[PDB]
Amino acid sequence: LKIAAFNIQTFGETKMSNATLVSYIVQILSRYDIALVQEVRDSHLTAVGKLLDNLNQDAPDTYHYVVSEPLGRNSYKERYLFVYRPDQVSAVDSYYYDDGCEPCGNDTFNREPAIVRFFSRFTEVREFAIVPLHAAPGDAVAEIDALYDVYLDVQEKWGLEDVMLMGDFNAGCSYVRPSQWSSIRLWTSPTFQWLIPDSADTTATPTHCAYDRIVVAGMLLRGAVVPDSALPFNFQAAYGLSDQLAQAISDHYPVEVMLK
Numbered sequence: 001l002k003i004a005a006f007n008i009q010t011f012g013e014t015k016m017s018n019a020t021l022v023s024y025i026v027q028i029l030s031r032y033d034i035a036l037v038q039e040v041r042d043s044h045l046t047a048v049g050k051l052l053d054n055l056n057q058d059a060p061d062t063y064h065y066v067v068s069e070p071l072g073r074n075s076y077k078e079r080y081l082f083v084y085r086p087d088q089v090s091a092v093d094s095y096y097y098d099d100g101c102e103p104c105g106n107d108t109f110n111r112e113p114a115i116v117r118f119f120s121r122f123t124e125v126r127e128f129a130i131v132p133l134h135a136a137p138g139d140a141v142a143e144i145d146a147l148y149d150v151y152l153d154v155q156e157k158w159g160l161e162d163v164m165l166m167g168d169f170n171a172g173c174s175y176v177r178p179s180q181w182s183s184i185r186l187w188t189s190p191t192f193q194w195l196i197p198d199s200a201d202t203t204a205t206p207t208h209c210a211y212d213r214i215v216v217a218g219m220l221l222r223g224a225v226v227p228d229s230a231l232p233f234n235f236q237a238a239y240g241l242s243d244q245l246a247q248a249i250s251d252h253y254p255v256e257v258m259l260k
């Protein structure tokens with residue numbers, strides 16, 4: 001089974017009204033049984049609707065989706081979107097993480113995770129959750145750290161230790177410096193296995209940064225991970241694109257992984 005997290009830079013009406021970009025976005029997303037899409041700026045869900053229509057172009061129900069409400073402390077707010085192949089997996093339910101008091105300017109996440117629970121008959125782990133995160137780059141250390149508490153919360157809600165935490169964590173370059181790692185409970189705790197390594201390049205631009213990550217916890221899920229299957233998908237190289245076209249699709253590569 002194949003799972004990916006993809007930040008598609010300011011995804012919304014503009015990209016979805018461009019047939020060339022749609023073509024590639026669809027081709028990338030269609031690789032996966034579950035795909036998290038981040039940076040969804042789509043206040044009326046019309047871009048999301050266009051995406052699904054394109055995903056389902058030659059067969060209805062090829063993809064279903066779950067989408068969060070817009071999240072963020074001010075403009076511009078972003079939705080977390082999960083598209084998935086419903087013949088492969090089922091999105092069972094979801095909830096918004098309680099990151100404390102927003103009106104207070106006190107809360108722990110810019111875009112608190114909208115957590116989705118999946119059932120998957122073809123893998124060694126049947127029940128697992130995905131916690132999505134597009135971290136605020138200026139608060140990346142505290143937000144990644146806070147995912148430790150999100151993990152503990154998932155066990156409170158669902159009794160579930162099998163949890164994949166993934167997305168654009170902004171976990172590298174200037175946002176998380178080499179020595180700041182011990183400040184991050186999600187990293188210091190042996191509860192978690194970091195699948196995308198520190199050496200990864202997950203940017204479509206010429207920087208070399210391991211921004212986008214996939215982290216797993218729980219006996220059944222960790223056992224289900226194919227070791228070394230977690231990698232950035234360089235769609236520029238894969239499809240032989242120019243720098244221009246690649247970067248117009250997104251400034252990030254998806255990060256993908258296989259579960260057995």
Ligand SMILES: *[C@@H]1O[C@H](CO)[C@@H](O[C@@H]2O[C@H](CO)[C@@H](O)[C@H](O)[C@H]2NC(C)=O)[C@H](O)[C@H]1NC(C)=O
Nearest residue numbers: 017018019020021022242244245246247248249
């Ligand atoms: C759809 O997207 C493509 C790719 O970004 C756009 O085509 C590019 O347009 C720019 C600016 O005019 C050119 O510099 C590139 O040479 C074009 N790239 C390719 C691959 O052809 C196009 O502008 C978009 N279409 C519309 C109508 O906005």
Ligand SMILES: *[C@H]1O[C@H](CO)[C@@H](O)[C@H](O)[C@H]1NC(C)=O
Nearest residue numbers: 099100101103104105106107
């Ligand atoms: C945030 O603000 C409220 C009101 O000032 C305060 O009572 C609370 O202790 C603060 N919360 C945290 C988690 O620091």
Ligand SMILES: [Ca+2]
Nearest residue numbers: 099107109110
């Ligand atoms: Ca918040």
Ligand SMILES: [Ca+2]
Nearest residue numbers: 203205206207
């Ligand atoms: Ca790069």
Ligand SMILES: [Mg+2]
Nearest residue numbers: 007009010039
């Ligand atoms: Mg971005």
